[PDB]
């Protein structure tokens, strides 16, 4: 159960990092 929970959480934190790079590109987009 430890491995399974933290594996799915690794996926959801790659989701949060998806949004990190999202706001990276919108960071340069506000620098525009």
């Amino acid at each position: 159960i430890k491995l399974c929970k933290e594996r799915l959480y690794s996926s959801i934190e790659q989701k949060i990092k998806k949004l990190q790079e999202e706001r990276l590109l919108m960071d340069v987009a506000n620098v525009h």
Binding site: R23, M26, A29, N30
Partner: protein, 33 residues
């Protein structure tokens, strides 16, 4: 007339530019939430 067209096109540019402004802060507040 060139004056009419000039004021028209710059008005439209200011239009879509303030649209860009408010949609950008839309992105900001959605990000926050």
């Amino acid at each position: 007339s060139p004056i009419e067209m000039e004021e028209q096109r710059m008005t439209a540019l200011k239009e879509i530019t303030d649209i860009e402004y408010k949609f950008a802060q839309l992105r900001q507040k959605l990000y926050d939430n």
